[PDB]
Assembly symmetry: D2
Homo-oligomer: 42 residues x 4
Amino acid sequence: KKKPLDGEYFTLQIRGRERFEMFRELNEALELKDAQAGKEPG
Amino acid sequence: KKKPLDGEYFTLQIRGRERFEMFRELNEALELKDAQAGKEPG
Amino acid sequence: KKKPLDGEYFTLQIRGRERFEMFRELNEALELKDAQAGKEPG
Amino acid sequence: KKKPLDGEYFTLQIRGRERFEMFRELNEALELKDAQAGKEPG
Protein backbone atom coordinates (compact mmCIF):
# COMPACT_ATOMS: atom_id res chain seq x y z
CA LYS A 1 0.00 0.00 0.00
CA LYS A 2 1.88 3.11 -1.19
CA LYS A 3 5.17 1.22 -0.73
CA PRO A 4 4.85 0.67 3.05
CA LEU A 5 8.66 0.28 2.98
CA ASP A 6 8.87 3.64 4.75
CA GLY A 7 10.09 3.72 8.38
CA GLU A 8 11.23 0.39 9.84
CA TYR A 9 8.41 -1.43 11.69
CA PHE A 10 8.80 -2.95 15.19
CA THR A 11 6.77 -4.92 17.77
CA LEU A 12 6.17 -4.61 21.53
CA GLN A 13 4.61 -7.02 24.05
CA ILE A 14 1.94 -5.35 26.25
CA ARG A 15 0.70 -7.22 29.34
CA GLY A 16 -2.97 -6.82 30.32
CA ARG A 17 -5.86 -6.58 27.83
CA GLU A 18 -7.25 -3.25 29.06
CA ARG A 19 -3.76 -1.73 28.78
CA PHE A 20 -3.38 -3.17 25.26
CA GLU A 21 -6.51 -1.42 23.96
CA MET A 22 -5.19 1.80 25.50
CA PHE A 23 -1.78 1.64 23.79
CA ARG A 24 -3.41 0.61 20.49
CA GLU A 25 -5.47 3.82 20.68
CA LEU A 26 -2.31 5.92 21.08
CA ASN A 27 -0.69 4.21 18.08
CA GLU A 28 -3.81 4.78 15.95
CA ALA A 29 -4.05 8.37 17.22
CA LEU A 30 -0.52 9.27 16.08
CA GLU A 31 -1.06 7.39 12.81
CA LEU A 32 -4.21 9.49 12.29
CA LYS A 33 -2.23 12.74 12.66
CA ASP A 34 0.63 11.43 10.52
CA ALA A 35 -1.97 10.24 7.98
CA GLN A 36 -3.27 13.83 7.84
CA ALA A 37 0.15 15.22 6.86
CA GLY A 38 -0.12 13.04 3.73
CA LYS A 39 -2.93 15.26 2.39
CA GLU A 40 -1.83 18.04 0.01
CA PRO A 41 -1.47 21.31 2.03
CA GLY A 42 -4.42 23.73 1.67
CA LYS B 1 9.26 -16.24 36.80
CA LYS B 2 6.64 -16.16 39.58
CA LYS B 3 4.21 -17.98 37.25
CA PRO B 4 4.04 -15.26 34.56
CA LEU B 5 0.69 -16.88 33.61
CA ASP B 6 -1.00 -13.79 35.06
CA GLY B 7 -2.79 -11.39 32.66
CA GLU B 8 -2.90 -12.45 29.00
CA TYR B 9 0.01 -11.01 26.97
CA PHE B 10 -0.42 -9.28 23.58
CA THR B 11 1.70 -7.63 20.85
CA LEU B 12 1.48 -4.36 18.87
CA GLN B 13 3.33 -3.16 15.76
CA ILE B 14 4.80 0.36 16.15
CA ARG B 15 6.07 2.17 13.04
CA GLY B 16 9.12 4.44 13.41
CA ARG B 17 12.12 3.68 15.65
CA GLU B 18 11.99 6.89 17.69
CA ARG B 19 8.30 6.25 18.40
CA PHE B 20 9.07 2.65 19.40
CA GLU B 21 11.56 3.69 22.10
CA MET B 22 8.92 6.13 23.39
CA PHE B 23 6.15 3.52 23.70
CA ARG B 24 8.60 1.02 25.24
CA GLU B 25 9.31 3.61 27.96
CA LEU B 26 5.59 3.92 28.75
CA ASN B 27 5.23 0.13 29.00
CA GLU B 28 8.26 -0.10 31.31
CA ALA B 29 6.99 2.88 33.32
CA LEU B 30 3.62 1.24 34.07
CA GLU B 31 5.36 -2.09 34.75
CA LEU B 32 7.59 -0.24 37.25
CA LYS B 33 4.56 1.08 39.15
CA ASP B 34 2.77 -2.27 38.96
CA ALA B 35 6.02 -3.94 40.08
CA GLN B 36 5.96 -1.68 43.15
CA ALA B 37 2.49 -2.89 44.20
CA GLY B 38 4.07 -6.37 44.51
CA LYS B 39 6.09 -5.21 47.54
CA GLU B 40 4.51 -5.94 50.94
CA PRO B 41 2.66 -2.77 52.14
CA GLY B 42 4.56 -0.72 54.75
CA LYS C 1 -16.97 27.59 19.91
CA LYS C 2 -19.82 25.10 19.39
CA LYS C 3 -20.72 25.47 23.09
CA PRO C 4 -17.43 24.14 24.51
CA LEU C 5 -19.47 23.40 27.67
CA ASP C 6 -19.14 19.70 26.80
CA GLY C 7 -16.98 17.49 29.05
CA GLU C 8 -15.51 19.16 32.15
CA TYR C 9 -11.99 20.54 31.53
CA PHE C 10 -9.03 19.94 33.88
CA THR C 11 -5.32 20.85 34.22
CA LEU C 12 -2.12 18.90 34.98
CA GLN C 13 1.39 20.06 35.89
CA ILE C 14 4.12 18.38 33.77
CA ARG C 15 7.76 18.73 34.87
CA GLY C 16 10.43 18.97 32.15
CA ARG C 17 10.00 20.84 28.85
CA GLU C 18 10.78 17.90 26.55
CA ARG C 19 8.21 15.80 28.42
CA PHE C 20 5.64 18.61 28.14
CA GLU C 21 5.85 18.73 24.34
CA MET C 22 5.42 14.94 24.33
CA PHE C 23 2.24 14.95 26.46
CA ARG C 24 0.84 17.90 24.48
CA GLU C 25 1.21 15.77 21.32
CA LEU C 26 -0.81 12.94 22.90
CA ASN C 27 -3.57 15.36 23.93
CA GLU C 28 -3.70 16.86 20.41
CA ALA C 29 -3.58 13.35 18.90
CA LEU C 30 -6.67 12.16 20.80
CA GLU C 31 -8.41 15.48 20.11
CA LEU C 32 -7.68 14.92 16.40
CA LYS C 33 -9.40 11.51 16.46
CA ASP C 34 -12.28 12.82 18.57
CA ALA C 35 -12.52 15.80 16.20
CA GLN C 36 -12.94 13.31 13.33
CA ALA C 37 -15.98 11.68 14.96
CA GLY C 38 -17.67 15.10 14.69
CA LYS C 39 -17.81 14.75 10.88
CA GLU C 40 -21.07 13.34 9.48
CA PRO C 41 -20.61 9.56 8.87
CA GLY C 42 -19.96 8.60 5.22
CA LYS D 1 11.44 19.75 48.88
CA LYS D 2 15.05 19.06 47.81
CA LYS D 3 15.08 22.42 45.99
CA PRO D 4 12.29 21.62 43.49
CA LEU D 5 13.86 24.38 41.35
CA ASP D 6 15.06 21.64 38.99
CA GLY D 7 13.48 21.42 35.51
CA GLU D 8 10.98 24.16 34.62
CA TYR D 9 7.37 23.15 35.42
CA PHE D 10 4.45 23.58 32.96
CA THR D 11 0.67 22.99 32.78
CA LEU D 12 -1.68 21.39 30.22
CA GLN D 13 -5.48 21.44 29.92
CA ILE D 14 -6.99 17.94 29.42
CA ARG D 15 -10.64 17.67 28.36
CA GLY D 16 -12.69 14.74 29.72
CA ARG D 17 -12.38 13.35 33.27
CA GLU D 18 -11.62 9.75 32.28
CA ARG D 19 -8.85 11.00 29.99
CA PHE D 20 -7.46 13.20 32.78
CA GLU D 21 -7.02 10.26 35.18
CA MET D 22 -5.25 8.40 32.35
CA PHE D 23 -2.73 11.18 31.64
CA ARG D 24 -2.16 11.72 35.37
CA GLU D 25 -1.16 8.04 35.61
CA LEU D 26 1.43 8.48 32.84
CA ASN D 27 2.89 11.54 34.58
CA GLU D 28 3.09 9.68 37.90
CA ALA D 29 4.52 6.62 36.13
CA LEU D 30 7.44 8.56 34.61
CA GLU D 31 7.96 10.41 37.91
CA LEU D 32 8.16 7.01 39.62
CA LYS D 33 10.95 5.86 37.28
CA ASP D 34 12.74 9.21 37.52
CA ALA D 35 12.30 9.05 41.31
CA GLN D 36 14.09 5.68 41.24
CA ALA D 37 17.18 7.16 39.54
CA GLY D 38 17.54 9.37 42.64
CA LYS D 39 18.47 6.31 44.74
CA GLU D 40 22.21 5.66 45.12
CA PRO D 41 23.27 3.02 42.51
CA GLY D 42 23.68 -0.52 43.90
